[PDB]
Design a binder for these strands. Structure first.
Lengths: 56, 117, 103, 142, 110
RNA sequence: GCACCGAAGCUGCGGCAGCGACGCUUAUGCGUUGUUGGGUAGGGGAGCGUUCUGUAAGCCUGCGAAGGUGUGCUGUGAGGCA
RNA sequence: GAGGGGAGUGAAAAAGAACCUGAAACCGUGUACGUACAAGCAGUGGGAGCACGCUUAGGCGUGUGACUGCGUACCUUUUGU
C-alpha cells in the first residue's frame, strides 16, 4: 500500500532503538598465544588453546 | 526598474518563527505550518483571556463556601446575609482573609447570622 | 497590621511596607496617595465596616509614576471567511509603597 | 496580587473512617466524593489533591432501596463479540461486593490522572475490621 | 590537547556508521580498538584506520602518553550523494542517490 | 415561596477611535458634553514598507559599511531604534 | 591511496583549489530540563517543582512545564464544512 502522511522523525527514532551493534568485549589472552583473541577460535598466528595449529 | 524580494520575507518569517519557539514538530520549524499554528494560538489567546475572569470568580467562591460551612452557613444563605445586614462590600478576592485569619472571617459570619436571625 | 481598600476599578488586601500596583492617577511622581476608602483595619484583630468605609481609617502611600505596561497582541481571525486583524495595547499603571494603616 | 493558591507539598490530607451499614448508596457516595476531593475543606485549588484519605467499614450492607434493589442495570464490557455482560446489584453483592461501591463512586468522581490520584486513596472493606489502623485514623459520620 | 582527526568522503549513509561509532563513543582506546576490530561491518574497518591514525596523530604532534586514553567525542555527518538514473520498467526513472559520510574523531586522555 | 448562581449583556475604573453640539479657539486642534465603534460581497477614507532616480562631489563609514545571526527596547499596526 | 593533523605561507586557512558572503529545508554532537497507567488539530489560561544570572531582593529575571480549566487544521467553493 502507501503511507497516508509523512511519519514523524520521532516515530522514526523510536523504530531505530534496536539497531545498534553488540560490543564484542569478551576477548581473552592465552599463555603461548601472545594474542588477545576471540573465544573458541584460532589466533592470527595459529594458536588454539596453547596448541600451535597451521604447524606440525 | 526591477525588484529582488527575499530580504523582508525572511525577516517576517523569522518574526513568525521566533514566536513559534517552544512547540512540537513542524510547528517549531516549518513556515507554512507555523503561520497557521501561531494565528490559531492568537485566537485562543484572545478567547481564554475572557475565561480567566470566569475561573477566578469560581475559585474564590469555592473557598468561601467551604469556610462558610465550617461556621455553619451555606454560600447562598451566607451572601444574602452579608447583603441584608449593612450591605457589606467585603469581597470574593478579599475573602482570602478567610484563608489567612479564621476569626476575622468569623466576624463576617457573625454579622451574616445577625442578618438571618 | 493590615487593611483592605477600594482604588479605581477594584479592591486590594494591603499591609504596611508592602508595594502594590495601581491605576494611572493624577498624583505627582513620588507623592503620596490617600485612601479614606477603606473597608477594614486590623491590628491582627479586626475593626471592620458597618456600612461601607471605616470611620477613622486612612492609608497614606507614596507612588512611583511608571508609564506604559507590557504589550499584548489582540488577534481577530475567522476561518474560511477571509478576515483577520491584529491590534496592540500597553495600558498605563503606577505602583505605590505603603506607609498607611492609620486611625 | 494573585490567588494565594496552596502547593502540592503543603496540604496535609489526613484521614476519615466511614461506616456504610445504615446508609443509602449514591447519597453515601456523594459524601465520599466531596471528602475524597477535599472540596469540603478549605481546598482552594482547581488542580491538586487536598482531601482526606478515607476508608470504609462494612460495605456490603449498604441500602440501594426502592424497587431498584432487584433490577439496577450494571453493564460491563469485555471487548469481544459477546462482550457485553450484565449484572445487577444483588448479584454483585453475592460475589465481588467491594467493587460495587468503587464503580458507583468512580463515575461520580471527576476526570483523569488527578481523579485516578484521588481514587487510589479510597479503600473499600466489606469486612468489619481494617489494617490501616496504623495511621491512628479519626472516625467520621455526616 | 585532543588533536582533531577526521576522514572525508567515506562510502556510507551515516546511519550505518553510527552503529559502529556509538560503541566506540566514550570508551578507553584499548577496549574500543578491539571492539572496532571484531565489529564485522564495512564502516568498522574504515573507522578503525581513522581512530588508530588519530591516536598516532595525537601521539606525534601534541606528544605521547597514549596509554590511558579514551576517545571522548566521535560523530558522523553526511557528505554529498552521487546522482545516477536507474533504468526501470516502461522507461520509468529512479533518482538513485549514492550517499557519502564524514567521520570525525576527538582523541583524548579526557 | 425566598435566595443564589449564571455571558464578551448592563453598570464599576483606566485607555484608544469616528461623527454632531458647546465653549477655549476664533482655519487648525484641543477642552467639555452627547452618542456611536460584529461584518463577507462591496464602496469610501487614512497608512507602512521595499527597489530605483533626485536632493547628494551633501552626509555616515575599514576605531569596521551592507549582508548574516543573536539580544534588549519601542509604535495602535504594518514596523522602527539601540 | 583517499583523507586528516602538525609544520609553513599569507592580514585572514572557520580563505586550501570540490575555494567570497554562507540563510532555510535537513541530519548530528554536547549541555539543561521533561518524558515508561496514560488518549485526541499537539495549543492557550492557570500552575507546583526543579535548573540557571542573582536583584533590598527573599518567590526579581530567564529556561523547562509535573499536573490542570477551556480547546473538532488551513485554503478554496458554497444554502451549508
Amino acid at each position: 500500500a502507501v503511507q497516508q502522511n509523512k511519519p514523524t522523525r520521532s516515530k522514526r527514532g523510536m523504530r531505530r532503538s534496536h539497531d545498534a551493534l553488540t560490543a564484542v568485549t569478551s576477548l581473552s589472552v592465552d599463555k603461548t598465544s601472545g594474542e588477545k583473541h576471540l573465544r573458541h577460535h584460532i589466533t592470527a598466528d595459529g594458536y588454539y588453546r596453547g596448541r600451535k595449529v597451521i604447524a606440525k | 526598474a526591477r525588484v529582488k524580494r527575499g530580504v523582508i520575507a525572511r525577516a517576517r518569517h523569522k518574526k513568525i518563527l521566533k514566536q513559534a519557539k517552544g512547540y512540537y514538530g513542524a510547528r517549531s520549524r516549518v513556515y507554512r505550518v507555523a503561520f497557521q499554528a501561531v494565528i490559531k494560538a492568537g485566537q485562543y489567546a484572545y478567547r481564554d483571556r475572557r475565561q480567566r475572569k470566569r475561573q477566578f470568580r469560581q475559585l474564590w467562591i469555592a473557598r468561601i463556601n467551604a469556610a462558610a460551612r465550617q461556621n455553619g452557613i451555606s454560600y447562598s444563605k451566607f451572601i444574602n446575609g452579608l447583603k441584608k445586614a449593612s450591605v457589606e462590600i467585603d469581597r470574593k478576592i478579599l475573602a482570602d482573609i478567610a484563608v489567612f485569619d479564621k476569626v476575622a472571617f468569623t466576624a463576617l459570619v457573625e454579622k451574616a447570622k445577625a442578618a438571618l436571625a | 497590621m493590615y487593611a483592605v481598600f477600594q482604588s479605581g476599578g477594584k479592591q486590594h488586601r494591603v499591609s504596611e511596607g508592602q508595594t502594590v500596583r495601581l491605576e494611572k492617577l493624577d498624583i505627582a511622581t513620588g507623592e503620596t496617595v490617600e485612601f479614606a476608602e477603606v473597608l477594614m483595619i486590623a491590628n491582627g484583630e479586626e475593626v471592620k465596616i458597618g456600612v461601607p468605609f471605616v470611620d477613622g481609617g486612612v492609608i497614606k502611600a507614596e507612588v512611583v509614576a511608571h508609564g506604559r505596561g507590557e504589550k499584548v497582541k489582540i488577534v481577530k481571525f475567522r476561518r474560511r471567511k477571509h478576515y483577520r486583524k491584529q491590534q496592540g495595547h500597553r495600558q498605563w499603571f503606577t505602583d505605590v509603597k505603603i506607609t498607611g494603616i492609620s486611625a | 496580587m494573585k490567588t494565594f493558591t496552596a502547593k502540592p507539598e503543603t496540604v496535609k490530607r489526613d484521614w476519615y473512617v466511614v461506616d456504610a451499614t445504615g446508609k443509602t448508596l449514591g447519597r453515601l457516595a456523594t459524601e465520599l466524593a466531596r471528602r475524597l476531593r477535599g472540596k469540603h475543606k478549605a481546598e482552594y485549588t482547581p488542580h491538586v489533591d487536598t482531601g482526606d484519605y478515607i476508608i470504609v467499614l462494612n460495605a456490603d450492607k449498604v441500602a440501594v432501596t426502592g424497587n431498584k434493589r432487584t433490577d439496577k442495570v450494571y453493564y460491563h464490557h469485555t471487548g469481544h463479540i459477546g462482550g457485553i455482560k450484565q449484572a445487577t446489584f444483588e448479584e454483585m453483592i453475592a460475589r465481588r461486593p467491594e467493587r460495587v461501591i468503587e464503580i458507583a463512586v468512580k463515575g461520580m468522581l471527576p476526570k483523569g490522572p488527578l481523579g485516578r490520584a484521588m481514587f487510589r486513596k479510597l479503600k473499600v472493606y466489606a469486612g468489619n475490621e481494617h489494617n490501616h489502623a496504623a495511621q491512628q485514623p479519626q472516625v467520621l459520620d455526616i | 590537547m585532543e588533536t582533531i582527526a577526521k576522514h572525508r568522503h567515506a562510502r556510507s549513509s551515516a546511519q550505518k556508521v553510527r552503529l559502529v561509532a556509538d560503541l566506540i563513543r566514550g570508551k578507553k582506546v584499548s577496549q574500543a580498538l578491539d571492539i572496532l576490530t571484531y565489529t564485522n561491518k564495512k564502516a568498522a574497518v574504515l573507522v578503525k584506520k581513522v581512530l588508530e591514525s588519530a591516536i598516532a596523530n595525537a601521539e606525534h604532534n601534541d606528544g605521547a602518553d597514549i596509554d590511558d586514553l579514551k576517545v571522548t567525542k566521535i560523530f558522523v555527518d553526511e557528505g554529498p550523494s552521487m546522482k545516477r538514473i536507474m533504468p526501470r520498467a516502461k522507461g520509468r526513472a529512479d533518482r538513485i542517490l549514492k550517499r557519502t559520510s564524514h567521520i570525525t574523531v576527538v582523541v583524548s586522555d579526557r
